[PDB]
């Protein structure tokens, strides 16, 4: 009676699931949250992981590590690492072409390999599972993007090992997503599946082929820095401009006012996925002025138009690299919280000639769900 877990070690957040009593439970942490930010903060007195780390990122930016997934398994010299560095507030150093994150922790300067940071997020996922199950957990399946190379998969494996996990297998995120939808168990036959993964920060399009239960990646396309946060920026910039046009004051130089507006915008954006309009109500936003306004879905769609239509560019590219016509795609799977946006679903559906989208599994949890299903299948031997 020792169940294995499935972990989606995400760029911005992580999610843990377990197949137990004939179904998957996506496990909530102590706060009741089913996702955990992939953030690790170092203070002068303690190390914080998850929401406590994200909460204070703007307070202690040099010592709050996120995006470790953008560094893991890569060499310091990699053009990807060298470009990502210019926009992170934390220091990235090297130990013979191996990148490391350098921080201040308890009055000491400490350096960590990306797998050491991710092992900290993984230890949190392990504890979360253990609190739920009521017994230790050591066996796990960890997901990775389909585009990761041997070095990136090995370093993810290393992060699991440091966390005291026995990594049963490293599997592709779109593969876990298709497994969550049971697309691997259709039976005798060849099927083409397209995974449309629009996250908080990343956009990934994967085309997989499933034949007699076996998976083959045909194409990986996407945008490494497009996501939910970009739609928030559009809403923020819009309301920074609206406040200025109404009250003739620029709020953008006040950190707290920008932060409070950004929080209200992100919630307004979520409300616009189920309603046609959202209210934005901030007391004493700037110079003591209350900001009470609204935004319609149509207005939000216009502000993000480029970002919305751009999601089809990697869909079109993926079909080309896969040497497939759009009619040859049997199944469409939505992953990532931003796929709840009606226009995102409309653009993709219209493109695939009204084809139904597999969206009944929470898009933030679908990857962990498939990994948990897979972990139970591997351990069943």
Curated annotation (Swiss-Prot):
Source lineage: Eukaryota, Metazoa, Chordata, Craniata, Vertebrata
GO process annotations (BP): ATP metabolic process; cellular heat acclimation; cellular response to heat; cellular response to oxidative stress; cellular response to steroid hormone stimulus; cellular response to unfolded protein; chaperone cofactor-dependent protein refolding; chaperone-mediated protein complex assembly
Disease: In certain aggressive cases of activated B cell-like diffuse large B-cell lymphoma (ABC-DLBCL), plays a role in the cytoplasmic sequestration of misfolded N-terminal mutated PRDM1 proteins, promotes their association with SYNV1/HRD1 and degradation through the SYNV1-proteasome pathway. HSPA1A inhibition restores PRDM1 nuclear localization and transcriptional activity in lymphoma cell lines and suppresses growth in xenografts.
Cellular component terms per the entry's GO annotation: aggresome; blood microparticle; centriole; centrosome; cytoplasm; cytosol; endoplasmic reticulum; extracellular exosome
Keyword Membrane: no
Positions contributing to ATP binding: 10-13, 69, 200-202, 266-273, 337-340
Record keywords: Acetylation, ATP-binding, Chaperone, Cytoplasm, Cytoskeleton, Host cell receptor for virus entry, Host-virus interaction, Methylation, Nucleotide-binding, Nucleus, Phosphoprotein, Receptor, Secreted, Stress response
Family as reported in the entry's similarity comment: Belongs to the heat shock protein 70 family.
Parent sequence residues shown: 3 to 380 of 641
Post-translational modification: In response to cellular stress, acetylated at Lys-75 by NA110 and then gradually deacetylated by HDAC4 at later stages. Acetylation enhances its chaperone activity and also determines whether it will function as a chaperone for protein refolding or degradation by controlling its binding to co-chaperones HOPX and STUB1. The acetylated form and the non-acetylated form bind to HOPX and STUB1 respectively. Acetylation also protects cells against various types of cellular stress.
Modification type N6-acetyllysine: residues: 75, 106, 244, 346
Induction profile: By heat shock.
Organism annotation: Homo sapiens
Name of the protein this chain belongs to: Heat shock 70 kDa protein 1A
Subcellular location: Cytoplasm; Nucleus; Cytoplasm, Cytoskeleton, Microtubule organizing center, Centrosome; Secreted
GO molecular function, one term: receptor ligand activity
Region (Nucleotide-binding domain (NBD)): 1-378
Highest taxon above the source species: Eukaryota
Function (record text): Molecular chaperone implicated in a wide variety of cellular processes, including protection of the proteome from stress, folding and transport of newly synthesized polypeptides, activation of proteolysis of misfolded proteins and the formation and dissociation of protein complexes. Plays a pivotal role in the protein quality control system, ensuring the correct folding of proteins, the re-folding of misfolded proteins and controlling the targeting of proteins for subsequent degradation. This is achieved through cycles of ATP binding, ATP hydrolysis and ADP release, mediated by co-chaperones. (Microbial infection) In case of rotavirus A infection, serves as a post-attachment receptor for the virus to facilitate entry into the cell.
Effect listed in the UniProt record for changing residue 75 to Q: No loss of acetylation and ATPase activity. Exhibits normal protein refolding activity during the early phase but exhibits defects in ubiquitin-mediated protein degradation during the later phase
